[PDB]
């Protein structure tokens, strides 16, 4: 439903321009994020347009971004300006649950969210995710979004708005607040679940990522008797 276009490669201290093609099943008032992930590092927001057109950035990197839409080309728009090899990432646009494939760029010639760095269990049973703010407890106001990515790259969300679960999202995936804590119960996990977990929290006018949770599922298949 979502596609970015890039350029592969942009030249030091020059403008990177990416394109978000959406197509599809749509309900209003989500707005477009930008999102970038560097080569062994985590996950960083750009920012964000909303459908009324008003813009949210990462205020670290507000002076360098433009974010702009064309909705008779369904499109949205993301330029950054000044690149330096730091800028080399896999750059993602996400609408709610819906993330694009990415594409890489590379350079050639706050508040804090913490989240178990990693879990195991066994297939049929029951695990628990957790997010924390530093700011205090988690609150429905931080509307706690929670996003999959298996092998290859492959971002989905799987709950926004702390427990509205995606279309298509397996009925086992489930949010809710727990104690001072966002949590993503994974009810009769399954060997597909295996994967990294990210949870993001909103604060006012931003999205700040946790570090994500690497889920191991351990078990092998046995004989089954009818």
């Known amino acids: 439903q979502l596609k970015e276009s890039g350029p592969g490669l942009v030249a030091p201290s020059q403008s990177l321009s990416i394109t978000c093609t959406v197509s599809?099943?749509?309900?209003?008032?989500?707005?477009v994020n930008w999102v970038r992930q560097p080569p062994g590092k985590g996950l960083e927001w750009l920012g964000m347009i909303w459908d009324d057109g008003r813009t949210d950035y990462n205020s670290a990197l507000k002076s360098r971004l433009s974010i702009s839409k064309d909705n008779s080309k369904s499109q949205v728009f993301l330029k950054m300006n000044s690149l330096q090899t730091d800028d080399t990432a896999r750059y993602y646009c996400?609408?709610?649950?819906?993330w694009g494939q990415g594409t890489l760029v590379t350079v050639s010639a706050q508040a804090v969210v913490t989240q178990e760095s990693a879990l195991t269990t066994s297939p049929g049973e029951t695990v628990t995710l957790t997010c924390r703010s530093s700011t205090g407890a988690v609150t429905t106001s931080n509307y706690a979004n929670w996003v999959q990515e298996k092998p290859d790259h492959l971002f989905s969300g799987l709950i926004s708005g702390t427990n509205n679960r995606a279309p298509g999202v397996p009925a086992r995936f489930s949010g809710s607040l727990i104690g001072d804590t966002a949590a993503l119960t994974i009810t009769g996990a399954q060997t597909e679940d295996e994967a990294i977990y990210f949870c993001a929290l909103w604060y006012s006018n931003h999205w700040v990522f946790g570090g994500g949770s690497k889920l191991t599922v351990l078990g092998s298949h046995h004989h089954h008797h009818h």
């Open positions: 599809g099943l749509s309900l209003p008032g989500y707005g």
């Open positions: 996400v609408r709610n649950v819906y």
